[PDB]
Design an enzyme around this catalytic site. Structure first.
Site: not given
Ligand code: GTP
Ligand code: GDP
Ligand code: MG
Ligand code: MG
Lengths: 155, 424, 423
Positions: C90, C136, C170, C219, C243, C245
């Site tokens: 996306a 996404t 990002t 994570n 769910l 509750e």
């Molecule tokens: N806490 C946490 N945040 C994450 C992780 N991966 C990505 N993010 C956060 O999610 C935000 C968006 O990144 P992604 O979730 O990778 O984007 P995506 O949902 O894969 O969507 P697209 O890559 O554009 O197709 C960023 O600001 C990251 O900081 C993760 O494993 N843990």
């Protein structure tokens, strides 16, 4: 929703499956659509063991619904003498009013539950209490031809 | 978003293009025969991006350029089919490249473009290197772009366009060709790196102290900048990973997609860098206008978006600190209405020769200075109507020059508007 | 009984890995799916060959992240039809996640969910894992939530959103994506636990003693706090056993369904009391969303203890905080703290920087101070939308520009909804 299964049971009267649903932490005072708790429903359809189970687990004995009906209203309407004395012993509102202005004494008198009328009276019922139209419990006995009730109301 | 198809057109196109393939073939550990002799997995992790053997198409109307590439060092590796070359040359006539002679050949090129894209798992987009003052690189390139844009509208178009300067060639029709070509790029490409020969000369002359810079000297600065900006694309990394994500975080307004690239440290052709720089030193090569590949002063404008790429083993903690530092200590130079507009990324594999490096891709409104220079040269030429019979003879209309002139000036005004904008 | 988990975007998928890694350790389930040892089958199903399969779907519009799942330690755990990948991502664009790219795969995704729901008898609802700033995570999730409110409309749906933070951000347009999904997913979500990546960053730097945390660091910390919330559903506790509750206890207003989660203790791997950990639940430093509850009114508050806990120690620590701090409640609230306990110890990962603690607690509290988090997003949003910055990317991928304003008004209205409750 576990509060909705406990209403289904308390109504239809499955004594055992109340204990199951309550052991799963179901909301004892769970409201359906018109604000009726399970204590309301059990007191309507005469399930004495389900009433005492819900009361001792903490059921609002003076809970009202969307129309201001307490469980004592519904018990005195249908004529469940066993349940009436259980509610009153658990601190029921003997002179509760509902949206139509009736007390539990009004309903027990209309339905001819003479044995329940005497129980309510001895728990300090308001014999002179009026409804919306302005009629007492004594007026109902006058209007309805019941002289057995007129004598039981002036005792 | 995996594969990238590469194109090089015109003399300059194939020159800095081959130089680019020389650089990143080494960095990925590929020999001229096309065999892996590296020693790391971070190298072949995303080799599928630029290779299959390069996914490169070589184009020129000048047939001589064919041999200047194959007789080069990595000239053996390119696919023989992907060489598409004309009989005669364009001779610095944008119209000949865009309407007459370049148009006759452009079909043969699209046939090879189709072939290479056909066998791609998931295409990202395209990548074009070319010069803007020429006839083939500018005229046929911009024609190729439009022809691809319409055949592949679901893909990114990324160009490495080099700006002409009197300091590198005294041809006076270059302002015409570049203006006509800028009129194309502002409408046809998602992102374009502005390589200014004015700035390449001023860097080779003043900073590197070379009295007469050659093309090779300027081409060294280019190929090193290219591998730096494409570092994210070629190795594993979280930030600015693919072409589309990059453009999304760099271009807030579709027409204003002309990046001012710059990188550090500036080295000579095969010289020795005695002491590897520190993180705060690299960081202080951003505002340092002597490191910009475009002849513009960032102090004279405001940054809309910034991407920093640090290559080498270093403290991620220190880089974050220094970048967060330099932003707020110059807070009046970064636009306020775009929060967190600067983005930094690190790659452990440095570029060959250097222990550490840092590339600074920036959408700065100061770039209007560059377009000012081209327009004033264009207008001075156009008001006296010099050399117009070249272009008009090839089917062009005099009106086109006025539109490209006006369209470039609107582009300048837009940059000036957002420079004077306020958050209040 | 059963509950289905769905993981959208890299955030969802990679946090999912951390959670199902942690679920399998808490349930003694092997990487190959076996078990040398019900309440836990809320989350797992069973093969005829004694194998325990998660009730989970993984979705990403791009292979790389999910490819590592099916070639990783737990490649055998999931059925290959559960791991779904597209090709074109996306690109940090809600429009592509929701309109352009999301529509190409939404039907395959809904179909694979039906296969897990057909295996289930009394399905409860869905847990959804996704980022805010991701294209996404924002776009596709909001689409999937719309379609799940149709094909399964009469059941619950819970969110686990990743609130963005410049330290790991990002994309520039992450405020846009957050506002856009929060607008379209507001009506379709019953309750939603936000996770500010800044707080998780701050926590990992202070209490885990890490200079520059990685995604695995964050994570793992997140999976611990998620496990604490889903523990009641996986071990048959007393509080929050299903769910519904969650909405009953924590949601006294359909819109304002965003609880603040606080977790203690976070002990580096290089014991505390019941009273000490309960005081840390009212310390902002251990919250998952950066705000100040002292500036807000509480609508509800639950405490989920797990481990070596004496029920009387809890009541003392409650009375201590109810007497020696001034936790302001709204007048139309029961103002009584709900409690539940699960005597099993908090499992950590072998090798994890997080140490095994004797007891732990996770306080879920729907405070009005979480509106401060919405104010920070709305402000960033306003600055960029004032100049219509980056808007052409969204409009060029099937999105009407008006949707920006309609989303912002829904965010301004929500800020007023939080204000009027707390006055
Ligand atoms: N806490 C946490 N945040 C994450 C992780 N991966 C990505 N993010 C956060 O999610 C935000 C968006 O990144 P992604 O979730 O990778 O984007 P995506 O949902 O894969 O969507 P697209 O890559 O554009 O197709 C960023 O600001 C990251 O900081 C993760 O494993 N843990
Ligand atoms: N940096 C760089 N610029 C070049 C090179 N060759 C030509 N140019 C520039 O490109 C312009 C000439 O265009 P050219 O590419 O030679 O014409 P073409 O063959 O028709 O594309 C002039 O402004 C030159 O300064 C090169 O090798 N490196
Ligand atoms: Mg030529
Ligand atoms: Mg992704």
């Amino acid at each position: 929703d576990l509060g909705k299964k406990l209403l289904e049971a308390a109504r239809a009267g499955q004594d055992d499956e109340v204990r199951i649903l309550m052991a799963n932490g179901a909301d004892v005072n769970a409201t359906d659509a018109s604000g009726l708790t399970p204590l309301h429903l059990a007191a309507t359809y005469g399930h004495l063991e389900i009433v005492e189970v819900l009361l001792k687990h903490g059921a609002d004995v003076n809970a009202i619904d969307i129309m201001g009906s307490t469980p004592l209203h519904l018990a005195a309407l249908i004529g469940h003498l066993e349940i009436v004395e259980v509610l009153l012993k658990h601190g029921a509102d003997v002179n509760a009013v509902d949206t139509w202005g009736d007390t539990p004494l009004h309903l027990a008198a209309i339905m001819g539950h003479l044995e329940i009328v005497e129980v309510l009276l001895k728990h300090g019922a308001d014999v002179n209490a009026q409804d919306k139209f302005g009629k007492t419990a004594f007026d109902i006995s006058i209007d309805n031809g019941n002289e057995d009730l007129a004598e039981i109301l002036q005792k | 978003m995996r594969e990238i198809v590469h194109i090089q057109a015109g003399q300059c196109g194939n020159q800095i293009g081959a130089k680019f393939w020389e650089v990143i073939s080494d960095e990925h550990g590929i020999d001229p025969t096309g065999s892996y002799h590296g020693d790391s997995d971070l190298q072949l992790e995303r080799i599928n991006v630029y290779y299959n053997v390069p996914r490169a198409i070589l184009v020129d109307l000048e047939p001589g350029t064919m041999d200047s590439v194959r007789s080069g060092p990595f000239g053996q590796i390119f696919r023989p089919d992907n060489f598409v070359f004309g009989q005669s040359g364009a001779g610095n006539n944008w119209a000949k490249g865009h309407y007459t002679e370049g148009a006759e050949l452009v079909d043969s090129v699209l046939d090879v473009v189709r072939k290479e894209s056909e066998s791609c798992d998931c295409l990202q987009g395209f990548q074009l290197t070319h010069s803007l003052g020429g006839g083939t690189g500018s005229g046929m390139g911009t024609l190729l772009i439009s022809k691809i844009r319409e055949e592949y509208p679901d893909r990114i178009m990324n160009t490495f366009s080099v700006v002409p300067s009197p300091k590198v060639s005294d041809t006076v029709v270059e302002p015409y060709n570049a203006t006509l070509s800028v009129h194309q790029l502002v409408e046809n490409t998602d992102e374009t790196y502005c390589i200014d020969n004015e700035a390449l000369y001023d860097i080779c002359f003043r900073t590197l102290k070379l009295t007469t810079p050659t093309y090779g000297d300027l081409n060294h600065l280019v190929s090193a900048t290219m591998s730096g900006v494409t570092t994210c694309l070629r190795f594993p990394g979280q930030l600015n990973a693919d072409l589309r994500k990059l453009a999304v975080n760099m271009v807030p307004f579709p027409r204003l997609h002309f990046f001012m690239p710059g990188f550090a440290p500036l080295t000579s052709r095969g010289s020795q860098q005695y002491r590897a720089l520190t993180v705060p030193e690299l960081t202080q090569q951003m505002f340092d206008a002597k490191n910009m590949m475009a002849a513009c002063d960032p102090r004279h404008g405001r940054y809309l978006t910034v991407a920093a790429v640090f290559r080498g083993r270093m403290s991620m903690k220190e880089v974050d600190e220094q970048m967060l530092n330099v932003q707020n200590k110059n807070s009046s130079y970064f636009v306020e209405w775009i929060p967190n507009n600067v983005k930094t990324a690190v790659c452990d594999i440095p570029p060959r020769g250097l222990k550490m490096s840092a590339t600074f891709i920036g959408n700065s409104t100061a770039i209007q200075e560059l377009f000012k220079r081209i327009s004033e040269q264009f207008t001075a030429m156009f008001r006296r109507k010099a050399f117009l019979h070249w272009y008009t003879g090839e089917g062009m209309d005099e009106m086109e020059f006025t539109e490209a002139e006006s369209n470039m000036n609107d582009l300048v005004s837009e940059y000036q508007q957002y420079q004077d904008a306020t958050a209040d | 009984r059963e509950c289905i988990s769905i993981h959208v975007g890299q955030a969802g998928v990679q946090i999912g890995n951390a959670c199902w890694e942690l679920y399998c350790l808490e349930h003694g389930i092997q990487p190959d799916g076996q078990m040398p040892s019900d309440s836990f089958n809320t989350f797992f199903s069973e093969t005829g060959a004694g194998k325990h399969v998660p009730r989970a779907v993984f979705v990403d519009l791009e292979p790389t992240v999910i490819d590592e799942v099916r070639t990783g330690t737990y490649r055998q755990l999931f059925h290959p039809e559960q791991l779904i990948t597209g090709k074109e991502d996306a690109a940090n664009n809600y429009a592509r996640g929701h309109y352009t790219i999301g529509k190409e795969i939404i039907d395959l995704v809904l179909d694979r969910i039906r296969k897990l729901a057909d295996q289930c008898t009394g399905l409860q609802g869905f847990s959804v894992f996704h980022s805010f700033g991701g294209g996404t995570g924002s776009g596709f999730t909001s689409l999937l939530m719309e379609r799940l409110s149709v094909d399964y409309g009469k059941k619950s749906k819970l969110e686990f959103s990743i609130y963005p933070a410049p330290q790991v951000s990002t994309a520039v347009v992450e405020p846009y994506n957050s506002i856009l999904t929060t607008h379209t997913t507001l009506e379709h979500s019953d309750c939603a636990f936000m996770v500010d990546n800044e707080a998780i960053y701050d926590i990992c730097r202070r209490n885990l003693d890490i200079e520059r945390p990685t995604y695995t660091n964050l994570n793992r910390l997140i999976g611990q706090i998620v496990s604490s919330i889903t523990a009641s559903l996986r071990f048959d506790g007393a509080l929050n056993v299903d769910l519904t509750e969650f909405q009953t206890n924590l949601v006294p207003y359909p819109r304002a369904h965003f609880p603040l989660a606080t977790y203690a203790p976070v002990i580096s791997a290089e014991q505390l009391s019941v009273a000490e950990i309960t005081n840390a639940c009212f310390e902002p430093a251990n919250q998952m969303v950066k705000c100040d509850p002292r500036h807000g009114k509480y609508m509800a508050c639950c405490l989920l203890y797990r481990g070596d806990v004496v029920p009387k120690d809890v009541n003392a620590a409650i009375a201590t905080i109810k007497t020696k701090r001034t936790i302001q409640f709204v007048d139309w609230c029961p103002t009584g703290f709900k409690v539940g306990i699960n005597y099993e110890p908090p499992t950590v990962v072998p090798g994890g920087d997080l140490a095994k603690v004797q007891r732990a607690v996770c306080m879920l509290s729907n405070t009005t101070a979480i509106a401060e988090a919405w104010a920070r997003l709305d402000h960033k949003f306003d600055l960029m939308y004032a100049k219509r910055a980056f808007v052409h990317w969204y409009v060029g991928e099937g999105m009407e520009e008006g949707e920006f304003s309609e989303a912002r008004e829904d965010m301004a209205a929500l800020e007023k909804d939080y204000e009027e409750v707390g006055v």
